[PDB]
Design a protein around this ligand. Structure first.
Ligand code: ER0
Ligand code: ER0
Ligand code: CLR
Ligand code: CLR
Ligand code: CLR
Ligand code: ZMA
Ligand code: 8K6
Ligand code: 8K6
Ligand code: 8K6
Ligand code: MYS
Ligand code: MYS
Ligand code: MYS
Ligand code: MYS
Ligand code: MYS
Ligand code: TRD
Ligand code: TRD
Ligand code: TRD
Ligand code: D12
Ligand code: UND
Ligand code: D10
Ligand code: OCT
Ligand code: OCT
Ligand code: OCT
Ligand code: HEX
Ligand code: NA
Length: 390
């Protein structure tokens, strides 16, 4: 076979290229949030936590990956730390993505409560806690769930390791039951499914809000036409009672209020006339409603639609991030599943292991590109930083 160093040179070169790009792109993210107070919100605190995890992939995880590819002799607990540290960063990523999804879910479901439920001070606490949990989950093998007690003597002697040392190779020291049941099923796949569920609920909530606006609008307009071709007070009375309900629902910032005050007032004026039997005065009063609608209500309606559309677009953008996370990490997990559940199967070849590893690391490059393409405030801040400071 070809000298191993030839394939190793390609591996190391690609890992270093990923490292540089992971560091540069994610530093730009952090720099942008620092510069631009418009980007300084709780959602972006999680973005910065995720960018920090991606910088740490370039600075630490990639160097550790290069090291462990050599099978160097190491004390088994030192080997575990180098093998498992990337699991801490990946777990931190998962918590940041989960926090973002729930943040956007609260923002769309209880917008009035959001700013008092979800504060910077609480966010910072949540981020600290998530990082501590990430260290505990990813370094669980250091607590004894490891293969350090069952060393590969063949490898130890061939690499000529000293006493207490192992040839530091991932699948020799990290148990596959940990990787499949604990890391993959419990710590990765369950959070990804929860995130899928939350995004689904976001899109369902936006659509139901947009439906309710459009139904209130159409209720207004249709009862306006009922009133016009009406024949008696009872008809006009009913159509106005329906308009009043529709109007109060639509309502649930000074110029906005004034507009609905004019509407409900005009409705209530036409309501008192109807009761007293004056059908034509009620019908005439109701013709006023059309200019209030055109001047005030159609403006609030289109503003509300435009806000919801922006929330849906932002939610799509963040869901893309989760989808790319999944794309980049699932191959390695699926390979581990074959290793573990199919002992009759040939192990995935080395070249495929290293491709899957490289793909996992490429995840730490992509997010700054998604922000730049999808989120105008990031794109514009990146432009300013690049022009001015380069
Ligand atoms: C990637 C680049 C663009 C940016 C990187 C930035 C800088 C700061 C990287 C820092 C790298 C270091 C943290 C790397 C640590 C390397 C360690 C893990 C090597 C360990 C090797 C070792 O133990 O020696 C081998 C022998 O001692 C062994 O065989 C016997 O014990
Ligand atoms: C995020 C997504 C939208 C795009 C990501 C792009 C992905 C596919 C990365 C592209 C890189 C590849 C085209 C090149 C990688 C080739 C490497 C993995 C070959 C590995 C060779 C090998 O087996 O070397 C290691 C061993 O031979 C042994 O010597 C240990 O070092
Ligand atoms: C501020 C940052 C850069 C500090 C980085 C510290 C890192 C590189 C240190 C902390 C713990 C260290 C490990 C401690 C124990 C061992 C076992 C030994 O047999 C081989 C080296 C090895 C595996 C060390 C490699 C380097 C190491 C991983
Ligand atoms: C998430 C998206 C990108 C799908 C990726 C699926 C990948 C991970 C799948 C596609 C086909 C799969 C391979 C098909 C056959 C074998 C041979 C078996 O003896 C070891 C596992 C191995 C090598 C599988 C590992 C995982 C694999 C490479
Ligand atoms: C995509 C997300 C939502 C689900 C992930 C599906 C994973 C867990 C599935 C997809 C394909 C599956 C593999 C398909 C084939 C085999 C070979 C069999 O001898 C053992 C089970 C094994 C190795 C399966 C294990 C579980 C597996 C890897
Ligand atoms: N299975 C696996 N192996 C490795 N590296 C070792 C690749 C390899 C596997 C077999 C071999 O004989 C020589 C090298 N890194 C790995 N990282 C992960 C991982 C991280 C998150 C999910 O899986 N899994 N994983
Ligand atoms: C992109 C900057 C330069 C790229 C680095 C060149 C790669 C050569 C280093 C070779 C060292 C090999 C160490 C042992 C590997 C054996 C693993 C089986
Ligand atoms: C908001 C700043 C980020 C906070 C990061 C601090 C993390 C400190 C290290 C975590 C300690 C947990 C120990 C559990 C694993 C022990 C295994 C030997
Ligand atoms: C298994 C699910 C994975 C599906 C991937 C979802 C991503 C869709 C891509 C469309 C939008 C991408 C915007 C910019 C792409 C830049 C990529 C570096
Ligand atoms: C070998 C390094 C892999 C880096 C691959 C990262 C892909 C990022 C997408 C960039 C697309 C830019 C398109 C501009 C027109
Ligand atoms: C920053 C304050 C300390 C955080 C306290 C974390 C609470 C941990 C509760 C149970 C630990 C479960 C870890 C799984 C091994
Ligand atoms: C054989 C080396 C084992 C070292 C483990 C000692 C540290 C105890 C871990 C406590 C974890 C607390 C984290 C908060 C959940
Ligand atoms: C999302 C579905 C996840 C469940 C996958 C569990 C698969 C277990 C595979 C059992 C294989 C045992 C091998 C027997 C020869
Ligand atoms: C990065 C994940 C996608 C990899 C696509 C390549 C699939 C080819 C798999 C063939 C491997 C068969 C080797 C078994 C001996
Ligand atoms: C409000 C913006 C603050 C930016 C914080 C930057 C944190 C960077 C930590 C990266 C750690 C990698 C080693
Ligand atoms: C704007 C507040 C966000 C602070 C997040 C910073 C996270 C830094 C953790 C560094 C751990 C890297 C090993
Ligand atoms: C006594 C040699 C093996 C011990 C492994 C040390 C790993 C944990 C210490 C690193 C601290 C992180 C900054
Ligand atoms: C600048 C960072 C380069 C990566 C460091 C390489 C570490 C390889 C150690 C080899 C162990 C025998
Ligand atoms: C280290 C400061 C940021 C420099 C910006 C250079 C271009 C960023 C490239 C993104 C992959
Ligand atoms: C575990 C991740 C959940 C983060 C929730 C987001 C903020 C809610 C504060 C009440
Ligand atoms: C593998 C399941 C996670 C996908 C979630 C992405 C939502 C578009
Ligand atoms: C239902 C799970 C049991 C299969 C375990 C197989 C381990 C190789
Ligand atoms: C990028 C593909 C790696 C090489 C595949 C075949 C090597 C035997
Ligand atoms: C200059 C970096 C060399 C990589 C380790 C052999
Ligand atoms: Na990450």
């Amino acid at each position: 076979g070809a000298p191993p160093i030839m394939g190793s040179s390609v591996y190391i070169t690609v890992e270093l290229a990923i490292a540089v790009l992971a560091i540069l792109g994610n530093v730009l993210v952090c720099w942008a949030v620092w510069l631009n107070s418009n980007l300084q919100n709780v959602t972006n605190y999680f973005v910065v936590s995720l960018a920090a995890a991606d910088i740490a992939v370039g600075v630490l995880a990639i160097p550790f990956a290069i090291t462990i590819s050599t099978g160097f002799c190491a004390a088994c607990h030192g080997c575990l730390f180098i093998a498992c540290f990337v699991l801490v960063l990946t777990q931190s990523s998962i918590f940041s993505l989960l926090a973002i999804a729930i943040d956007r879910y609260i923002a769309i479901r209880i917008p009035l409560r959001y700013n008092g439920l979800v504060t910077g001070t609480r966010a910072k606490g949540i981020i600290a806690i998530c990082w501590v949990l990430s260290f505990a989950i990813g370094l669980t093998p250091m607590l004894g769930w490891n293969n350090c007690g069952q060393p590969k003597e063949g490898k130890n002697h061939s690499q000529g390791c000293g006493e207490g040392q192992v040839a530091c190779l991932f699948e020799d020291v990290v148990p596959m039951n940990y990787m499949v049941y604990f890391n993959f099923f419990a710590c990765v796949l369950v959070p990804l499914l929860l995130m899928l569920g939350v995004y689904l609920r976001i899109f369902l909530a936006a659509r139901r809000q947009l439906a309710d606006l459009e139904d209130n609008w159409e209720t207004l307009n249709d009862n306006l036409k009922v009133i016009e071709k009406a024949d008696n007070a009872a008809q006009v009375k009913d159509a106005l009672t329906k308009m009043r309900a529709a109007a109060l629902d639509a309502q649930k910032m000074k110029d906005f209020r004034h507009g609905f005050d004019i509407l409900v007032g005009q409705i209530d004026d036409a309501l008192k006339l109807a009761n007293e039997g004056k059908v034509k005065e009620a019908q005439a009063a109701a013709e006023q409603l059309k200019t209030t609608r055109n001047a005030y209500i159609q403006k609030y309606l289109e503003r509300a639609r435009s806000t919801l559309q922006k929330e849906v677009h932002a939610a799509k953008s963040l869901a893309i991030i989760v989808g790319l996370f999944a794309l980049c990490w699932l191959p390695l997990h699926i390979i581990n599943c074959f290793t573990f559940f199919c002992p009759d199967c040939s192990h995935a070849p080395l070249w495929l292991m290293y491709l899957a590893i490289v793909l996992s690391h490429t995840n730490s490059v992509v997010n700054p590109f998604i922000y730049a393409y999808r989120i105008r405030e990031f794109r514009q801040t990146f432009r300013k930083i690049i022009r001015s400071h380069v």
